[PDB]
Structure 1
Amino acid sequence: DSKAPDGSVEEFLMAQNRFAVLDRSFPEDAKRLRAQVAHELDVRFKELEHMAATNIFESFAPAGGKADGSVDFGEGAEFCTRDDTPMMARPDSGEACDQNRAGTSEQQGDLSKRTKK
């Protein structure tokens, strides 16, 4: 909504004591820092200009869906979804499952094949 830096930052900064005292006490550092501010806003503005010209933007869904129903992230999982800790214990936990101590499904599968009997 606004335009490119018009070049008056310096007078803008120097017109405020929060910047001016620095100038009166530490001239060298202050000029560097005021120059740094002019640089920052210069880069920022260019970035804002690019944002305004991009044609790369996320869509947008206001809401809608969910409805009645909820499912536990553990339901129907092939391997244990919770640990053996008191922290993950819940009223409905405690059922047997593959705790990943026997290896992958294919690994277990191939081991079976190799030991058949």
Structure 2
Amino acid sequence: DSKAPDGSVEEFLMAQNRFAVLDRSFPEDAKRLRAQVAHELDVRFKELEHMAATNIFESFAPAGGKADGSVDFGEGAEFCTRDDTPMMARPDSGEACDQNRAGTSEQQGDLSKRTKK
């Protein structure tokens, strides 16, 4: 909604004591810092122009839709989804599951084949 920097930033800053007071006490640093601010707003405005000109923006797909009910993340999982500690213990926890101490599914299957007997 606004236009590119018109070059009056130096006057803008010096018309406020929060900036001018530094120029009076530490002129060298102040001069450097006011130039830095000028550069910052220059870069930023360009980035905003880039945002406005882009043809790629964050759009969203249709949606998810109403969902009557819910489900636990561990329901029907192949391996345990919770550890055996007090922190994950829940009223409905405690059922047996694969704790990943015997390898992946394929590794376990292959071992079975290689062991057959």
Do these two structures clear the TM 0.5 threshold for a shared fold by scoring above it? yes
54-63 or 35-44: which moved more? 54-63
Report runs of 4+ in structure 1 exceeding 3 Å deviation: 60-64
Identity level (%):
100
Give the Å deviation of 1:65.
1.8
**3-state SS of paired residue (1:79):** coil
Gaps of 5+ in 1: none
Q: What is the TM-score when the length of structure 2 is the normalising length?
A: 0.96
Tell me the number of residue pairs that the alignment of Structure 1 and Structure 2 aligns: 117
Q: Supply the distance in 1 between the matched residues of 2:59 and 2:45 (Cα, whole angstroms).
A: 25
Q: What is the TM-score when the length of structure 1 is the normalising length?
A: 0.96
Alignment CA distance shift 1:38-1:62 (3 Å): farther
**Matching of residue 10 in structure 1 with residue 10 in structure 2:** yes
Q: Supply the distance in 1 between the matched residues of 2:27 and 2:9 (Cα, whole angstroms).
A: 17
1:3-49: CA deviations, max 9, x gaps?
00000000000000000000000000000000000000000000000
Gaps of 5+ in 2: none
Give the Å deviation of 1:58.
1.8
Partner of 1:67: 67
Alignment CA distance shift 1:44-1:63 (3 Å): same
Give the Å deviation of 1:92.
0.2
Q: Supply the distance in 1 between the matched residues of 2:64 and 2:111 (Cα, whole angstroms).
A: 48
Give the Å deviation of 1:60.
3.3
Root-mean-square deviation over aligned CA pairs? 1.4
Partner of 1:31: 31
1:48-107: CA deviations, max 9, x gaps?
000000000121369662331100000000000000110000000000000000000000
